[PDB]
Recover the amino acids of this structure.
């Protein structure tokens, strides 16, 4: 019954992990936080499906699925520079444990590898060297882990016409990219991300700048005058770097109901099953034939606070403004309810937040100044609404229909509220190994 | 299981060593701090590789590898005045322990030395007298320790075409030389460094000046009017002096992915595995054939604070300004979060820092005045950003495209943030013993 | 294992001796401080070299080496008025212990003396009557103790061509004479020194003046108008007087690497191995053939504070100014960090220092007024730098290249900093007994 995590016992992340999985009993026994979430997510999926089922693994590392008693079929294309290391590590643990266990199948996995090694285009029960689109093995359940570089409707179609009914997806929350922020943080998982255009800023999580005296004139022949989010984004998980795309990240922010219309029509649902401080598990059920009705709305439930505000910084010497997002723990948000009734300065908000934080800290200190600035702008915009009050049921657009728009500098989603976004829901258009590496793999299994 | 370090038990460096190696259990049993980091770094590498592997040692001292049960092949060119002492010390411990151990190979190492002594250009299993480029022995794993005077892409190529797949590098953090500072400190390892041009300053860690009355006129015929970093730099580790080069230090600040393009193409990765207050361990994997894509970005994760500011000093009598860098412990940085919300004078910052330090001191007292001055300049530049706020999404470069650059006097990287630097990622161009010493070595082994 | 010193147990010098020799266990059992440092320095050297080695002693007193089990060859020229007393004391202890010990060679030393007594120009295993240059015995290890009146490169050459590879030097720190001070103190060893020109001052450690009423006119025909250090200097160790030379003292302040170029070329290193409040042990390794590269820099690491300031005094009735140096304990320096943030008067600095000193005193009270005056001048010159701040990377030498030099009245080297000096590193030019005493020596051994 009990489940054990490989983290400490005095940390604050233990309680969050407990309350994210309330049907387990997690016990204690810069990547441990992300590991344990992934450990409990795989355990949940197994408990959720009947055994003796064929399980696909899209873009996997087979060394993690080797010691499990389930019909795993790992898919390992050569897409990144870290992939041959994943393959080579598998070939070692297979040889290094080729006779020490007589319960789980270990000799069959050895034969599959050396068959694919000999014949590099053969589909085998527990291995292949294809993508998620070109693989031809039939199954019923698919699993994704940290897969951010594929189009979700196109990938999900190609698993459907091969008999998959149930899919999961583990990874970072996609909500900050639907609000279109320029940079942000996932502070509990040691992660910062930023747009390419602001990598030379000064006071965000992921940046680097220089010392300078400054000129009163810097002529240029090229004039931008426009600073908006672009497609390419950089992630830093600890000290590991990952480039990603906005379009492919947003495509995994799926609505409640959507239809896939190809040569075989399907009707699909998407629900969020786990949620812990910026890391989520999604579940997608699929079924043949198109029926029901779609609205095109996606909903996010907020167990902690979500913030997004305007900041001023210097980027390569030039002063500019853009938006930053972050997550705030629920206990901190509850204890600021009284203070935000009136207008408070950013300096006084900062001192109050530091006092509330000394309870070891609840939140990281490098995000405190931008959180204190968002809270005071939110309290000021609430007062202005109350002092400029309109008539019930009446928009006053007045002689020609031209109305005035107000300025909004903070978006604050309190705990127990919900975001709702209008997205697309009808989908119809669906657009390595070599001898030196081959020889090295074959040599170990010999 | 447990690992023991040769340092005290009441020092503050024990905790830092513990939290830098969280998968060990370090126990207590001006160079002890640097020793223990190097002891645990070698222990980690051995645990990371399967035994019965051939291990190279670039620019080594064989007396340290003598008592280890691994296939070490030491490489010892005669490049510095301290090298013949390293050779002579080996020849003593070999004779001095030629019959007292019957477990580790000791007689084979004796034969290799006297073979090279007789024939000074023979490659032997456990010794040679070549550089890292001209050696011709084949292996699979290479190790570097305190190697600062070689070009990294050129050295790493020549280990590749001889079958090396895995390399490590231990040494000082290269981040201060990518920010291009003029001087700096590594206070936990008793080290200061400085540019040649500022050796006659007054108030930095490594300098020396004179008493003088001062003239109102000192005519010169040569006019410099330009003070910028130059290639040659001096290091002082305790009281030992080392000259180094900026270009060769910066070349070990490698990106996540890079390609080596010679007569045998390779694709390479670089990750940072350990990090403790300015001393790091890097790991480089390599593989044949070129594949994947490169961005050219290098990332540093900051577990403690990193500072860099402008200071004013007198150099040989003349008042000037330049930049200095240092490291600040994380506990000190966290406790200044509240104070830096407002504008504070350098004098008041200094008094607060002294109070926080008396907890034996957390940080060395000679760096406190320059840290207190950086903190107050940072707090002032944050206020100016907040009071000169722009419009969202708009650069205001105005009739001809000429914008104003602001002045930046402090760079402050708080704990849990990351630096990101654009470096080069495609590499294609890859450019002693004598009789009196010979006789002395041969005499001992006789 | 344990080592015992002949000093008390409640003194503050015991802790300093402990932390200067951290690999020993010193235990308690106006010259005791200097004795014990010399006792532990000889013990270290023996532990550092393999036994059955021939050890030279340059300018020695053989009565100290008589009871030791090592191949000592004492060298005793008749250079000073205290030398025949050293010889006569040896001749007594030899006779006085000619039959009471049957372990260490005592009869062989008796024969060597009476052979040299009979034949005054014979080289013998354990005695000779030559200088360090004219002696012709071959050996491998040399030792110097309190040798201040020889040229170091010339002396070290003549030990090289006779097969010496390893040399040591014990004595006073040479750093104050590289800064060119006019007078100074070594307060923990009961020593003061001064230049000949200031022996008639009033308020320094070593001086003497008169009572006078003073004239408003004292005509002279000779005009000096220049007061600068000259070669001859006087030392007072307790109440014993020693005259020395600046040039010969400075020649033992050797760089990290230097070359000796004679009829037999050598390459040499110099490291500082022990350091305790002004007394040091140096180690010099030497090797044949010239190789490597030299920079010409010498480095001093400061474990305590080092001060040097301008003082005003009366010398033979006339008011003048000159520079004085001293050493300050590290605990005192740490506790003044807060105070020196602002500007403090000399009177208020003095009262604070007296309060901190009553912890028996940490430092001698006669040096307190000049230390308090240096600290307040240093704090004032730091404020002026901060209020006259320049532009980064720019010397402003302005129409003709003539810049203004500032006044410097204090040099303060804090604990954990390093001095660095440019010295010469290439060396190529290398420029008694009578019957009444003879009869007296011979009579005892008869
Ligand atoms: Zn497949
Ligand atoms: Zn070799
Ligand atoms: Zn002699």
């Amino acid at each position: 019954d009990p489940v054990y995590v490989d983290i400490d016992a005095d940390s604050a992340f233990l309680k969050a992990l407990q309350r994210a999985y309330p049907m387990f009993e997690v016990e204690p026994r810069d990547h441990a936080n992300a590991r344990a979430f992934s450990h409990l997510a795989i355990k949940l999926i197994e408990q959720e499906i009947d055994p003796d089922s064929t399980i696909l693994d899209i873009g996997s590392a087979p060394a993690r699925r080797m010691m499990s008693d389930r019909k795993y079929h790992c898919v390992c294309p050569m897409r990144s520079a870290e992939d041959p290391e994943r393959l080579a590590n598998y070939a070692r643990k297979l040889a290094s444990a080729a006779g020490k266990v007589l319960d789980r199948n270990i000799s069959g996995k050895i034969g599959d590898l050396q068959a694919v090694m000999a014949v590099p285009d053969t589909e085998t029960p527990t291995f292949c060297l294809h993508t998620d689109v070109s693989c031809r093995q039939r199954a019923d359940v698919a699993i994704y882990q940290d897969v951010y570089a594929v189009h979700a409707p196109t990938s999900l179609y190609h698993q459907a016409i091969k008999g998959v009914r149930l899919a999961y997806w583990v990874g970072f929350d996609t909500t900050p990219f639907m609000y279109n922020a320029m940079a942000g943080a996932y502070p509990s998982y040691s992660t910062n991300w930023a747009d390419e255009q602001v990598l030379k800023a000064k006071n965000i999580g992921l940046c680097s700048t220089d010392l300078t005296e400054g000129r009163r004139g810097k002529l240029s022949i090229m004039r931008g005058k426009k600073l908006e989010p672009c497609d390419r984004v950089l992630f830093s998980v600890g000290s590991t770097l990952y480039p990603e795309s906005r379009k492919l990240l947003k495509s995994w922010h799926l609505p409640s109901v959507f239809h896939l219309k190809g040569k075989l029509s399907f009707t699909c649902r998407c629900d969020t099953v786990v949620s812990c401080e910026g890391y989520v598990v999604k579940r997608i059920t699929m079924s043949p034939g198109l029926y029901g009705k779609t609205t095109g709305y996606a909903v996010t439930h907020h167990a902690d606070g979500f913030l997004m505000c305007k900041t001023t910084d210097t980027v390569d010497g030039e002063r500019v403004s853009f938006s930053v997002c972050t997550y705030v723990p629920a206990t901190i948000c509850d204890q600021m309810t009284g203070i935000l009734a009136t207008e408070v300065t950013p300096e006084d908000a900062q001192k109050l937040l530091v006092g509330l934080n000394q309870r070891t800290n609840t939140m990281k200190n490098y995000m405190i100044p931008v959180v204190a600035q968002a809270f005071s702008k939110w309290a000021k915009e609430c007062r202005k609404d109350m002092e400029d009050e309109k008539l019930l049921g009446v928009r006053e657009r007045t002689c020609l229909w031209a109305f005035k728009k107000q300025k909004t500098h903070t978006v604050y989603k309190r705990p127990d509220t919900q975001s709702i976004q209008k997205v697309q829901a009808e989908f119809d258009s669906f657009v390595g190994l070599s001898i030196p590496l081959r020889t090295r793999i074959k040599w170990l299994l010999s």
Summary: The longest strand of chain C covers residues 266-276. The CA atoms of residues 304 and 329 of chain C lie 5 Å apart. Chain C is about 25% helix and 25% strand. Residues C 73, 75, 123, 128, 130, 135, 137 surround zinc ion (ligand 3) (CB under 6 Å).
